[PDB]
Amino acid sequence: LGRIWLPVLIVVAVAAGALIVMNVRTVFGSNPVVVTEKTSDNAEDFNPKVVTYEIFGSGSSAVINYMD
């Protein structure tokens, strides 16, 4: 391999250098924005508790104030 050893080793070295270049070149940057995760709850109406107000008396009418 007197006339084969040189070009093969040259190609091997060039491939190694290209691989190193490709790997490290992309590491820079790659983190421009930060996006926080979202964890919401299911907004549904199943078995809602029911509150009832009742006003009654011997009078005809009344004035009523209440808290919703």
Partner: protein
């Protein structure tokens, strides 16, 4: 001095702190952008 090795190391801490402050609030899903001299030189050091 913000333009030192100590100054540029605070950039990740700020982003972590803001992301943790947002956690659990209606602000979830927000986007955080950090800029300035110290951030610029942090990026410069990584690139170098």
């Amino acid at each position: 001095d913000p333009l030192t090795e100590e100054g540029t190391a605070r950039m990740d801490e700020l982003k972590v702190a803001a992301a943790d402050a947002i956690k659990g609030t209606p602000f979830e899903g927000a986007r955080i952008y950090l800029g300035g001299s110290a951030a610029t030189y942090n990026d410069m050091q990584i690139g170098a």
